[PDB]
């Protein structure tokens with residue numbers, strides 16, 4: 001079959017990093033997040049972040065070092081860049097929300113610049129090295145502190161990752177965000193209790209950010225670490241996002257996903273075409289996959305189910321085999337979890 005048709009090879013020199021950077025910046029400057037004031041705030045934010053997105057810029061050096069490190073899953077450059085762009089989009093949404101809650105005093109250019117710079121640094125930290133050990137995140141933080149010019153927390157030993165940037169554009173510790181809950185006497189060691197702490201509040205913010213953009217994500221880490229629990233707490237805390245836990249097995253097939261879809265969603269005919277919508281209105285059906293990487297590869301190194309989620313995440317839809325018709329996904333997003341592949 002290789003010799004039965006032509007060929008073209010696209011190496012990874014085809015997209016220079018600056019190519020992706022210019023695509024992201026142009027798409028942000030043109031299209032608005034909601035679907036105009038927020039386009040104006042996007043333009044201002046992009047004007048702020050342009051100096052760090054140039055060739056031989058802060059993001060490029062940070063990315064090459066993150067490649068020099070080790071990550072729990074296979075590090076792909078576009079994965080890091082797409083995560084960073086999604087989190088920057090959420091930063092712009094946060095600025096828009098702050099403006100909406102303060103009609104008298106819209107956030108000025110100086111505060112916007114400070115917030116965007118600090119969010120960019122924190123975003124690099126949590127996107128490039130968010131899938132590494134704590135020590136490797138510390139190494140990346142030390143590097144980026146060495147090479148960047150953005151002001152950073154002056155904690156003598158606390159790495160920047162434990163810090164957060166306030167909507168007022170200031171470096172504030174994540175510790176203050178952690179409350180002190182008093183669980184009831186009969187609720188000790190309960191299957192649902194979630195004591196807030198540094199890790200779960202940071203992961204709460206990250207889950208909120210990557211779920212607002214409807215970017216699917218998978219939690220990685222050693223068995224019994226607080227991953228499934230933190231995810232469920234976040235998802236239940238979510239206002240209008242139903243949660244559908246799904247225990248993927250080694251015998252998992254996309255047929256199971258279709259079963260869940262017909263159980264919770266329904267097919268309706270719209271002028272664009274057949275559209276998948278969850279039955280209950282205004283709800284982002286978040287399909288939790290307990291063990292995303294568990295399903296077996298075939299003899300040709302392909303997990304059919306993960307191919308299905310890739311198809312639906314990228315193309316924004318799938319094909320209904322009943323009538324071989326394109327079905328677009330509406331109000332559906334995915335989150336998974338898995339221990340390291342080792």
Ligand SMILES: Nc1ncnc2c1ncn2[C@@H]1O[C@H](COP(=O)(O)OP(=O)(O)OP(=O)(O)O)[C@@H](O)[C@H]1O
Pocket residue numbers: 190191193194195196197200222223224225226227228229230337338339
């Ligand atoms: N911050 C916390 N507050 C309360 N309990 C916690 C906290 N962090 C972890 N735990 C407890 O530790 C365990 C963490 O479970 P976890 O959510 O990691 O499971 P899991 O994702 O299903 O595991 P696995 O990968 O082995 O299948 C639970 O028993 C949970 O109650």
